[PDB]
Design a protein around this nucleic acid. Structure first.
Ligand SMILES: [Mg+2]
Ligand SMILES: [Mg+2]
Ligand code: NA
Length: 129
RNA sequence: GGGUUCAUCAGGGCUAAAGAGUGCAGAGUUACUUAGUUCACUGCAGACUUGACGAACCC
């Protein structure tokens, strides 16, 4: 499943991300856009042997277990397979842990490059929330 | 058997213009969509239009 912009905005709102840790809803929508292009099934392999999974491209070294990543830490207590779902629950719950860990949304390289400091509110414009 | 009107039903859109989308009032199953005051779902109304069993009158 690939989410539409406003469709994802409404789900993320339902899941408590609007102003989660001080980040307005548009930040999360923007981050998904540039991490995954809103694609719940995206994956990307890294040279350290880890893989990024799902709509927020959460990484298998620290956060989720894919059983194929050296030095797995399983800090979200989930298999990476839970992050490849049309149901965004697992991605959101894990993202809430990630963003609470010390550098806020700086954890998402695509957010820092493409979203941080911009008019992120444009990402929720026109949306029925 | 056809016209005018009427009655009881069934169905179908349409409801200024503009606009991809808005008849009016609700809703929220993420479906559809460029998200939407315009969109899946639920009421309600008007002018039509089609069909059915008919009635009055006219040809
Ligand atoms: Mg019109
Ligand atoms: Mg409406
Ligand atoms: Na418009």
């Amino acid at each position: 499943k690939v989410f539409g912009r406003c469709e994802l905005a409404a789900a993320m709102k339902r899941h408590g991300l609007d102003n989660y840790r001080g980040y307005s809803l548009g930040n999360w929508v923007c981050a998904a856009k540039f991490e995954s292009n809103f694609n719940t099934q995206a994956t990307n392999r890294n040279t350290d042997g880890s893989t990024d999974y799902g709509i927020l491209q959460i990484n298998s070294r620290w956060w989720c277990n894919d059983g194929r990543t050296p030095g797995s830490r399983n800090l979200c207590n989930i298999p990476c397979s839970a992050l490849l779902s049309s149901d965004i629950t697992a991605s959101v719950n894990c993202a809430k842990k990630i963003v609470s860990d010390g550098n806020g949304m700086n954890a998402w390289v695509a957010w820092r490059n493409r979203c941080k400091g911009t008019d992120v509110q444009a990402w929720i414009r026109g949306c029925r929330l």
